């Protein structure tokens, strides 16, 4: 749903890199491998954690029971 | 039949630890 704090396999903190990954994908015209490398993700265990994240939290957040729609 | 499209720009990604 929301980005995991750490990589499952090794434990490297990858929770602070999802927004940067999106920025490097959108603003810069970087491919996914280049963006992951420039974030500091060398092991494929760490690369998959960001390369394959879905970010369903944004779709969950549109159903807000506390604000008039 | 056309062969499966070979991806381009394939570089080295694996390096020995510490390098």
């Amino acid at each position: 749903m929301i980005v995991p704090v750490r990589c499952f396999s090794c434990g490297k903190v990858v929770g602070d890199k999802w927004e940067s990954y999106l920025n490097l994908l959108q603003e810069d015209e970087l491919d996914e491998g280049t963006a992951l490398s420039r974030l500091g993700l060398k092991r494929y265990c760490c690369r998959r954690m960001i390369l394959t994240h879905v970010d369903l939290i944004e779709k969950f957040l549109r159903y807000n029971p506390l604000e008039k729609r | 039949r056309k062969d499966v499209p070979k991806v381009e720009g394939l570089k080295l990604e694996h390096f020995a630890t510490g390098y």
């Binding site: 704090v5 434990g11 939290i57 604000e67 | -």
Partner: protein, 304 residues
């Protein structure tokens, strides 16, 4: 015979690099029985500080309370583990936590809609106020003597940019997290290394000369700085073994099937250590060595 002196004569350390997060070094003329002991202690036995007990006061966000507490337990904290003691679990909940072993973090954040947002704005940071909750929002609430002992170094996450949660207007989070000392063999959140491991130094025994164009392709079968062409004679030689990642691409050609043997130096360990952020990798290794020694000494002094 084997002796501590005969080990001290031959053991040596070659630090290849050393940062505040990652330290790459070598242990030579040591046994896997001790290198693996060091690696296992680094991963599991060296203590660190992580959030353990979370006291929610309100959570109207989409993320549920147990998930949020798990995420808050995962974020690493820049606390020197020596600055606090160990929690005595047998004591009652009232007196269990004290100013010398517990660090109190709070997170109070309400989302309100931004009344100045432009029309057609899709950025949550422009549409809403506090639409994102980060680890940096985890304020440190010192209590007792730590108000003076931690004045030199306030407790902050090693990664303040960790996206803890997201919010929408009306939603809010109000919680307290108690951070204590623990080891990584109990829960993986207390592990102070992103990953600590080693690998034997590869050996590339060239058996027959590879003079000619064959040297160009043989050198092409390894990482770039592993094989070189000698200036004098057109011969391939092993420049740097440490640069080799053992992928056996040379074995996939029958040309070199009887010209090279790939092996290892069974005593030459290349330790690569990365730190989560609370401690430096060299101090992690030093603590693991000390832990092994102290546990052996405890066994020695234990009556049988």
């Amino acid at each position: 015979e084997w002796n501590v002196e005969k080990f001290k004569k031959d053991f040596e350390v070659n630090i290849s690099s050393l940062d505040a997060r990652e330290a790459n070094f070598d242990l030579i003329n040591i046994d896997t029985s001790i290198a693996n002991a060091f690696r296992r202690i680094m991963i599991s036995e060296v203590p660190s500080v992580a959030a353990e007990y979370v006291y929610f006061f309100n959570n109207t966000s989409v993320i549920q309370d147990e998930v949020l507490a798990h995420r808050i337990g995962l974020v690493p904290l820049k606390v020197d583990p020596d600055m606090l003691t160990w929690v005595d679990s047998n004591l009652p909940d009232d007196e269990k936590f004290t100013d010398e072993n517990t660090i109190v973090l709070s997170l109070n954040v309400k989302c309100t809609r931004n009344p100045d947002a432009p029309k057609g704005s899709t950025d949550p940071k422009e549409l809403y106020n506090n639409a994102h909750v980060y680890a940096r929002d985890l304020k440190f609430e010192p209590q007792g003597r730590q108000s003076t002992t931690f004045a030199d170094c306030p407790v902050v996450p090693a990664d303040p940019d960790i996206l803890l949660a997201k919010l929408r207007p009306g939603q809010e989070i109000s919680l307290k997290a108690h951070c204590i000392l623990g080891i990584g063999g109990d829960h993986a959140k207390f592990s102070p290394v992103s990953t600590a491991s080693y690998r034997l130094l590869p050996q590339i025994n060239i058996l027959q000369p590879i003079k000619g164009e064959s040297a160009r392709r043989f050198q092409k079968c390894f990482p770039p700085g592993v094989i070189g062409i000698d200036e004098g004679s057109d011969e391939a030689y092993v420049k740097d073994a440490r640069k080799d990642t053992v992928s056996r691409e040379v074995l996939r050609y029958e040309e070199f099937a009887d010209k090279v043997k790939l092996g290892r130096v069974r005593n030459h360990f290349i330790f690569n250590v990365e730190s989560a952020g609370a401690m430096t990798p060299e101090e992690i290794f030093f603590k693991s060595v000390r832990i092994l020694k102290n546990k052996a000494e405890y066994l020695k002094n234990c009556p049988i």
